[PDB]
Each structure stands twice: as structure tokens, then as C-alpha cells.
Amino acid sequence: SHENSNSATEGSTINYTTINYYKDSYAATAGKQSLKQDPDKFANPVKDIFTEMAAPLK
Amino acid sequence: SHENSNSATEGSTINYTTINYYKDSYAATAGKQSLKQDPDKFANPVKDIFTEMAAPLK
Amino acid sequence: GDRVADVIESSIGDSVSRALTRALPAPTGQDTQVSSHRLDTGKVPALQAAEIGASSNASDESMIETRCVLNSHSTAETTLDSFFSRAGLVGEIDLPLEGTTNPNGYANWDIDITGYAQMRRKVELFTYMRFDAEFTFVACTPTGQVVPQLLQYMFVPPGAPKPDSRESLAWQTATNPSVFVKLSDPPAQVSVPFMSPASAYQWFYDGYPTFGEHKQEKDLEYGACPNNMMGTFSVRTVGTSKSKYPLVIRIYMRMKHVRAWIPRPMRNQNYLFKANPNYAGNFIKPTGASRTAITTL
Amino acid sequence: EIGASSNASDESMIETRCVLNSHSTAETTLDSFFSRAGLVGEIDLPLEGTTNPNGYANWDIDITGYAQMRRKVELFTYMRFDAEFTFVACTPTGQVVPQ
Amino acid sequence: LLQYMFVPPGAPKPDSRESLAWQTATNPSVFVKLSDPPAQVSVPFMSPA
Amino acid sequence: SDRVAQLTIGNSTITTQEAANIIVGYGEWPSYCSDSDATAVDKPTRPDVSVNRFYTLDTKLWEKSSKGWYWKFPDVLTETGVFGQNAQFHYLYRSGFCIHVQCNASKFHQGALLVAVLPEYVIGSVAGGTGTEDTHPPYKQTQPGADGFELQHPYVLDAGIPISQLTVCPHQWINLRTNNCATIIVPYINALPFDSALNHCNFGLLVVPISPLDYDQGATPVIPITITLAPMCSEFAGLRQAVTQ
Amino acid sequence: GFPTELKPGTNQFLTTDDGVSAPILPNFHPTPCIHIPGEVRNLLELCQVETILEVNNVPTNATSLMERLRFPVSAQAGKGELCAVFRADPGRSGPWQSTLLGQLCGYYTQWSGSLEVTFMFTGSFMATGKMLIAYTPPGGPLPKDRATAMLGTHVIWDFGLQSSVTLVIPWISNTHYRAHARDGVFDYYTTGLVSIWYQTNYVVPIGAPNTAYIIALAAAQKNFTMKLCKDASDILQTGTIQ
Amino acid sequence: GFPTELKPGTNQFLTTDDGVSAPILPNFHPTPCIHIPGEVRNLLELCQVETILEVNNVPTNATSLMERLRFPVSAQAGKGELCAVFRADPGRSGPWQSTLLGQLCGYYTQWSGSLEVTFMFTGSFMATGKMLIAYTPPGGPLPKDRATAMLGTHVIWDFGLQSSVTLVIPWISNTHYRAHARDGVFDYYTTGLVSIWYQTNYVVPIGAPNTAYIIALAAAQKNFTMKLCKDASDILQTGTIQ
Amino acid sequence: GFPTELKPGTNQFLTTDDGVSAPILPNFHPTPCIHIPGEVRNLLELCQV
Amino acid sequence: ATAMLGTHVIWDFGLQSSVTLVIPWISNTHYRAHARDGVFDYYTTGLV
Ligand SMILES: CCCCCCCCCCCCC/C=C/[C@H](O)[C@H](N)CO
Ligand SMILES: CCCCCCCCCCCCC/C=C/[C@H](O)[C@H](N)CO
């Protein structure tokens, strides 16, 4: 299975499972993404992280 | 064969043989069920089971 | 912690469901073993007690002199998937040119399989059913003729905007799944998963969906299960002008991966309303046929 | 005030039981949310008209012409994706013709 | 567009083009058009003997 | 060894000397909700002995022309004791049941009662007789309370389902010649781990005399039928102010 | 450009065909299944549950539809008179339509296996008696008297503490399966007749009812199987379900 | 000449079908991806970010659309009066439509998980007071008074150096998922009511404002999930976008 | 989306063609075969009588 | 209906002529002084 490495998500740390019949990887199916989330990178993007149970402002 | 585990009968003690061409397991064929039966669980659901040849009421 | 005996020895929290029975494989019908004449006292298989509520367990060998028969009759065809995985009519959509029902070239069909007795009697045998669905849409003119018309079938989940016209903005289907087929093409066929919020569809819901007084105006809410409202089916003729041909669309449903719970008595009266066990009070007919006398056939 | 979402959990506020949550988060992913075909452009080829009476039409590729698609795509500032375009053609009456 | 229905012995025989038996909720049915290739199905050995 | 039995739970004890064994609904004892099946996050309350006890709710008189009666669960206990108080104060509900129907007569009386438990027993209307009227049963008929309700057409169970097939559900027979009591143990039967104890009725209990009561004139003409029942492994969740209906 | 050649059978819609269909909702995971009691796995489980057999299916009026469930016995002249007869066909029109076994066998063309019928006596405790229940294999007409009826498979029922007795209808057929029998040429698959005769009498003392009723429950044995799933014989629908 | 038979479902265009399509530009390599901050991977990341909850969504005129974001508190008579109420349904029409969580849940039919609501006090530093915030599980009507409201899940909020408090709305439902609730029979999936009552009073000294405003921020916990992706309830378009 | 190209001979019905057909009755098991004497296996057996 | 809410037993007449009702020791104090009319009814045991 020697095809072109020209999909929109090439060079990523995540693995997809796709079905393709052409030499161009962007023609493949959407497949399955990895279920990795980083909620904190929006929800709690503070420099000095503070403990849940403690006082946020000290 | 890495597909989604989203069929209606996932997480069961029984094994099916299905044909599928999509990543979603609920698109697969009906396949073959296991020929397990529990007739007694309706027919004789008594607490203290009684012998066939003996007297039901003693 | 726990220091009192009534707490230490308490069975509270034991979440294991003690099951007196366990499923055993039975690929074929049970074999019949050799039996001989049996003349003994005290022990009696023939006399039973249906009083207990358990089916009599007397076998052929314990009643009459039987031979040895190796039963190889398979029990595969009586399984749930074998019994239910056969497509049958569940809904019909009419798209007339001039009419009072759907003269706008579109029609919204609330998804429900209780509209046809053939399917309803089968599905209503069990209280709870969990299954996948496979829907096939056969469209044709009232004369059975196929015409070069392009249609759009939209799945509208509960809460999604219901289209109100053939050119409504809801038809942009940017999120809803849609199927575009022509009548000349083979009937459209898609697979629908188990979408109920509950762990299984329930055909009978002995309760009300919301609190409050259930007066006359708020009386149709009895027997309606929101956990079975899987959404609306929207179909339209893809175009800005009126379609040249009248269309009637028949929707066939075929369950698969079926699981069922809580068998109930099969219906024996004519159906009257969708999602309603109402029966003709004055026209209650017996389950089976009748005969003139009990002593004659 | 800090600008971070509160991290208080259920256990730290009320007396909770032990629930093994097996609800999958697969359908909220980017591909699951976006990989559904939707209308993005419409081309009209009339016989007699003022828009395209010449039998051809040039459609500048842009997905901002329909709010259904635009509201979804506009949720993020930057998007990188492949595209799959399907062209459904029919007469204004919905009839298919040998063209 | 035609409908071919297999009616096993004992099943209700349809009496009209709009009869309720055509709902085919249990009977196997084939829906084909004359423009399509002829419908072709495989039938097992169904005799009691 | 099978005709005499004693059921004790909570602070109540029920005895019987002419029992006919015990039916466990669908071969499954009542049990608490497992942590892999629970969906609510709040810790449920398990009052135990204060609610898991035998409640004697009402007494119905069996007559030679009786049609039958049915009760809805846990409607019968929504307004009874600490169990009713908990069901009113808590949104969620989960419990099993142990239904003991008492109907005692003499050796010269005859008749047979069919005591069955039908989950999600939805009551339908007669649809105005002909069937052209889209009626719905009133609140007093869909939720009869502790008084139960007398069936109008027991052959179809007022729901278009023949009673001849009712025995597929967990059931016992009270045939006055042999036994005077029927014991059915019913686990929680629902598609949800918890449900509202007021809006939703998990199952309905049916007591229909299949063989009419008979006796020669002079014998005791009052043959009462008394329903006694005890919730098993009751749980409650979602506490708020009390709600009466 | 893989060369394929379409063979006859394309473009058709076979309702019983087991095929793959495009999933409308990708990556959709259904609601997890909690444990619900009373799961069925095979219709044979339902076919083995006793249900009331409408042996006395003479009445038709609504006010007396309830007496179709049971048939009466009473003190007799002690000459072995006939009490009730009924055919043993489960999927045939008649008494067996009231049973869940018969209703399910209405969905299957061919059935094979021995059936079981249990009669529950609902008389007074002081009333005794003996009844003969005889099953006549196919080919023999309705027995004219008890002496003729005894020649087939039969059981002697003694009233006592054990209220009910079980009559096993053995699987006696020339063919491995029986197609659904009815009037005409298809009566070739008849199962036979079951007749109930007074063995001695219905004896009752002074002060107890003179007439007692018997409740018949019908079910199938563990060797019962069904084949050739078919459409239902009855369509519970007159017009459009509004 | 490989024999194939077309099965029903051919020639159709399913919008959600995941299939392969012919690439227009062979051997085309897209522009390499540089690192861009703030990449999202799951919409649950956005559903866990606090956004302003329009609890006080009474106004409609343009000049005062801004006061829908916050609702006022002031010195009271100390009888536990009611300050504000709002339903806990995120995808239902009402206050939750102003939140990103509600906007996203508008795209999904079924949601499951506990929600979290944080109220930010914007009063003067010298103004103190206590407020009771109570969540009423489904089935109970709007509480008539604080004594009735306290019986449900509730939190006591003390004004101090920590301006805001977090009220966790626990996942309390009979079903594993909630369909989108609305007026009619679909109110069966209601989540309940959240009511804010004055615990003691709003106490303020001489020289500080007598009325203070509270800003409510709503978000979802880490067990929040969504299912059955659906079409948007609002179409932000009147005619053709010119 | 597997690319296939139909070759001449499609849509035809060849009576002697040995192909696969959709089974009308899924999971149907035919009646077991008892032993019957005089089974033929080749018409040459009849041609030698 | 009110009486069933306390400790109770269901007695079935049969071959066993008699039934035993156990009055459990339910008291706030370790002992009960002799109860009578007046202020000393504080030590009442209850009603059967
Ligand atoms: C192309 C999209 C088609 C979507 C098909 C969704 C079908 C879902 C299967 C179950 C549908 C509910 C069937 C009826 C349930 C109950 O009997 C009624 N709601 C009674 O109220
Ligand atoms: C058959 C050939 C079809 C070629 C399809 C090319 C589509 C490329 C995908 C992205 C297209 C741009 C979408 C719109 C982007 C911005 O919102 C607008 N340009 C705003 O100026």
C-alpha cells in the first residue's frame, strides 16, 4: 500500500483508520479520530495552577 | 478491522458472525445468533424447585 | 466506620442479581429417550399443580412408553433476529399534486411503527425491545409507474427544526443526514442505530411524561413515551416548482440485532389508534373461532 | 475573576454515589461534527433569464452563502480539512432529464 | 414497479391489490421494476417430507 | 414442607398454612442498582426496614358475579407510610416487590383466581364502543390508587389483550380447594435504572376470577380478597420538596 | 476499473434479504444496556409456557366471553359420557388460538414436537371423581363412546390434593413436520382428537356445589420446534389506524 | 467479468455516508502545517468553558440588551425572598442559549452529564451578605418559598474575598440521556429548576452602592457527553445571503 | 467507492448460468433427510438398465 | 390500614391452630417502671 502522504492530517501524533482506493491520501474516508481531549488548555490556562480544594486567591 | 463498537448487542456474552463494510457496527448484517435458551426462567420460575417425578405440593 | 452488627452484617449494597436459572445451549430439539412400563406407588409424574404458576415438567417418557428418537430439528429460525429481521410496511407517505393532505410537495412523517397491524402485533409481543433498524423507501406514482423525479429524505431528530415548506431553510441539511435518490434508482436503504435515551424501546408506557394535572386538554399525554419519539421523517420533491408527477412513498422497516424483554399477551382485538391500546368496546370479539357445541367438532 | 473555569467536582459539593460512566465521547469530535454534507452553493442555468442565459455559470467557491454551513464552520477561526463535493442537478420541477 | 410475495401454506392469501396481506411484515417480498434485470431468489427445500 | 410458609421482612411477618410455593418474577430476586447501571450521581437513600415491610392496603369482596380487579405499582403505596413519604420527597425510584394475595374459604367453597403481574399494564378505553372516538382513561382509572379498579371487560383486560395468554407473566392460581394465598416476588422491571414513583407505574397486578365462586346457600357468603405487599431493596434519589401527585 | 458483470437479481428489494446499509449517524454510540429481567432469546421459551386453552369456545356474546376459558363438570349417570372434545392442532382455527403457543405457531408454517395439556380442577375440596382423557392419533374418527376412546393414548385423572393432571400429546406423525391443517385436502396433516370422558362420576357430598369447572392449560414440550416462518393468519386491522 | 449483484441502496446520495471520492488533483501535496496554538480536538473541550448565562433575559430593546448578562441584588427585608429562577436545560430555549455550552448542545439531541453554574458577585468590597442557591430535581414545581426550596440540592453562598461560588447541578435523571425538552409531552425530560434566595440579606455600609449585580457563568462538568448530532434549531438567515 | 467497470454480459438472464441468489428464508433449516433406497447419482446408472 | 403500619403478623387458620405474636422490646429506656394513668403513662409499652 504505497500511496502519497498528502492527507490534511499527515505528520500528526494520532493514528486514523481509513479506507482508500487511490494513490492520494486525501481521497480516503474520514475514519476514526483519537479520543484525546485537553479541556484544561481552554478551561484553566493559568500560569500558576491552583489546587481544586484550596483557595484560588491567596 | 478497526470499527466502532456501537452495535445494539455489544457487551454481550454471545458471539455473532456479521458482514460489515462501514466503521459503525450497527450497519452490519443481522448474522447468526447463539442458540441458547432458558425455558425454565418463564416456565418454572419457582423459589424452591421441585422434582419432576415427585409431588409438587408436599 | 462500621461497628454495629446490623451494619457490618447488612446485605445492603449487594448489587448481584441472584438468578435461579442460567441459559443453556439448545441448537436442536430435545431427544426422546427410551421408556418402559412403570408401575410404582408414591411417586407420580402425571399429577402436577398448575396452582403454583409453573408449567408442568412432565415429559413423554414419564407418561407413555416411548422409543429413542434423535431429534435433529434446528431451533434457529425461531430466534429473535430470525423472527423479526424481515422488512415490513411501517409508514406510507402521500405526495399528491392537488389535495388537502400534502399539496405543498412535502410531508413530515412522525416515526412510529404502530400504524400497521402486521408490524404492530409482532413488535407488541414484547414490552421492551432493543434493536437496530434498516429502512427502505419504495416510491412510485399511484399507478405503480416510475418517473424521473428526484427526492430528498431527511432524518429530523427530536428538537431539530421541522421543515414547513418545500423551499424551507431546514432543507440545507448541513447537520441532518439526508438521502437524495431518484425513483428510477433502486429504493433507498439506510441503517438506523438504537437512538432511544432508554436502554430499550418500550411499546407500552404505563405512565405520564410530565407532572401536573392531567385534564381533558392534557389527556393525550397518557401512553406517549418520549423515549420512543425518535424524530420526524421529512420528504420533499427536490425543486422550486411543483412536481410533474404524483407520488406515494412506502417505508419498510427491518429490525436487526434485536433484543427483547418481558413478553406479554399478543393482541386479539382490532387496532384503532397509533400509540394507543384502545379497542372497540361494543365489538369485542373472541380470540379464536367458535363452534356450536363442546361435545362435537 | 482569574479567567479559568471552576474546577469544583460533584464529589466536592454533594454526597455522590459511584457511577461508572461508559458514555462515549466519539460523536462530538471534529470529524464527527463536521463530516456531514450540507448545501454550500446553488447554480441556476435557466433557458430564458438575465442571470445565466448563456448556458454556463461561474460559481466562486465559498461556503459562506448558507447559514447552516456558515454557523458551523465559523465557530473556529482556523480550519484545515479536505473536501468532498457532490453535485445534485435537476430541473426546477425536480425532474431528471438526459442532459 | 411490481411486488412478488411468497405466501407459505396457511398464510393469508391476498384478495385485492390493496389487501392488508401486502404489508408483508412476515412474508418475504421482492420489489423490482420491469426496467431492472429479472428478479432472482433462492428457495430452500421446504417440504415437510 | 411446601404448603406452610412464613414471609418476614422489616417489622412485619406474614404466615400461611395452605401456600402453593413462591414465584420469583422472571427468576430474578430484587437487588440494588449496580454502579455500572446507575446514572444519577447523587448518593441514593436506602431506608431499609422503614419501607421494606408488608403493607395491607385494602380488602375486596369476591362475589359470584365479580369481573376482576387490578392495582398499579407503586401507585398503591405512593400515599402509604414512610414508603409513600420517601416516594413523594424523592424524584427517582427503584425497588422490587413481594405481593401476597390472601383469599381464604372453606372446603365446601369453589372458585379459581388468576393472580398475575403484568409490567407496563397500559389501560385502554372502550373508544366509545364502536371505536370511532379517541378517548383516554381518566386519572382515577389509569392511577386507581390503593382501591384498585374493577375490570370492565376482563376477557381483554380492558387493554385488547386476551387473559388466556396472561399466564406468560409471573402468576399464581388461588384455587380455593387447595390454596388460599398467592405469593409473587417481582424485581424492578423497567428500561431505566431509576424512574419516577408518581408518574410511571412499573407494573400492574391483576386478580381475575377465571372460575366463578360458588357455594350452597347457608355457607359464609362474604369471601374477601386482601392484598398484602412489601417493597424489596427500595432505593430513592433526587430529594426535593414533597409532591402529592 | 475492475471488470464486473451484473448478474440477474440486481436492483431488487428483497424484504428478507440480510444485507449491509449505510449508517445515517457516523460515530454514534447507542445508550448502554442496563440489565432488564425476563429477556427472551428464543420463541421456544414462550412456546413452553402454559396458557389457558379455550376448550369451551361455544359462546360469542360479550357478556359471556369469559366462560370460554373453562368448561363444567357435574354429577352424572355413571355411563362414561363425553365431556369435551377438541382438536390437537395448535395453529389451526379453534381452541388452540387462545394459547400463546397457538398464536406463535400461527406465524410458522411447520411445527414438530409433542404438546402438553394440563387441566386444572376448580371444584370444591370435598368433591371427588375420576375422568378419562384420551388422545386419538390421526386417522380415527371421533370416538362414539368411552370403550372406543380408551384404545388410544389416554390418562386416568383422579381428583385429589393435586388439583391438576398433565396429558402429554406425543409426537405421532408420518412426516418430520406438520403443515398447517384445515378443511379440505390439507386435513392430511391432522394431529388427532382429544376427548374427555367421565371415568366413574363426579361425586359430591351434601352441602357442596353440584357443578364444578375445569380449566385447561396448553403448552409445548421441550422437543417442540417450528419452521418456515410465515405471515400472520389474522390481520388485526380493518381500515387505516388513525 | 466478476459476477456482482446490486443490492438496494445504490445510486443514492447519503449526506452522512463516509465514502471514497476520486481526487481531482493527483500527486498534490498540501501546504505543510505549522504549529498554531489553541487547537481543539473535541467539542467537549468547548463545552467545559464558562460562558455568561443570560439569567436576567427579560429585556428586549437594543439600548438595554446589555443588561441581560447580569441580574441585580440589593438590601432586602430579610424574609428569604426570591431573587432569580431559571431552568437547568442547556439546549432548551431560555437563559442557556447565551452559553457556548447551550449553543453546542443545540446541535445534539441527547446530552448526559452534570452541569456547573458559577455566580460572580460584582458588588463593592464593603458589601457583604449570604445567598442560598437551590437546585430542584425534576418533578417538583417552582418552590413557593425558601423553606420549600432548601429541601433540594442547594449551596450557601457567603460574600467575601472569594467573589464567586460554584453551584454544581448533579446529573439526576431516570434515563441515561435527556432528549431536548420543550413545552408539551416532551417536558418529560426536564432537568429541574435553579432558584436563588436571599439567605440573610444584602448588608452594605453608609457610602457604598445599595444595588449590586451578579454575573452567572455556566459550563459543563467532565462527565458531560452528547449524542445524536442533529440540525441546528436556529437558522441565522432570512433570505438569500447576497 | 471501489472503482469497477461493467463488462459486456451484464443484466442478462442465462438459464444455464450457475450463480448465487438471495435466500428468501434466512436461518431456515430444511427437513432432515432419512434414508430412501434406490438413489440415483448419475444418469449412466439408468442408461445401463 | 393505620394498624398495619406498626409491627404486625398475619395469622392463617389451619392445621397449626395457634400463632405467636412477639412483642419486641422497643423502649427509649433500658427499663420500664410500672405505667398507669397520669404522668406515669410515660412508660407505656403500646397497644396490641
Ligand atoms: C432515514 C431516517 C429514518 C430514521 C428511523 C428511526 C427509527 C427508530 C426506530 C424506533 C422508532 C420508534 C417506533 C415506535 C415506538 C413506540 O411504539 C411509539 N412511539 C409509541 O408512542
Ligand atoms: C470540483 C472542484 C471543486 C473545488 C472545491 C474547492 C473548495 C476548497 C475548500 C475551501 C473553499 C473556501 C471556503 C470559503 C473561505 C472563506 O470563508 C471565504 N473565502 C471568505 O472570503
Numbering used by the authors:
A (entry chain D), B (entry chain D): 12 to 69
C (entry chain A): 1 to 297
D (entry chain A): 51 to 149
E (entry chain A): 150 to 198
F (entry chain B): 10 to 254
G (entry chain C), H (entry chain C): 1 to 242
I (entry chain C): 1 to 49
J (entry chain C): 147 to 194
The authors write:
To understand how structural changes during the uncoating process are altered by the K162E mutation, purified capsid of WT and K162E were examined by cryogenic electron microscopy (cryo-EM). The native state of the WT particle was refined to a resolution of 3.3 Å using the gold-standard Fourier shell correlation cutoff of 0.143. The reconstructed WT particle had a high degree of cross-correlation (score of 0.883) when compared to the previously reported EV-A71 native structure (EMDB ID: 20766). We observed classic “jelly-roll” beta-barrels formed by VP1, VP2, and VP3. Within that structure, we observed electron density corresponding to tightly packed lipid moiety, known as “pocket factor”. The pocket factor in the WT particle interacts directly with the VP1 beta-barrel. Lysine 162 in VP1, well resolved in the density map, does not appear to interact with nearby residues. Instead, the positively charged side chain is exposed at the surface of the particle, near the exit site of the pocket factor. The exit site of the pocket factor is near K162, but the pocket-factor and K162 do not directly interact. A side view of the WT structure reveals a tight interaction of the extended VP4 with the internal surface of the capsomer and the external surface of the RNA (VP4 in yellow and RNA in orange).
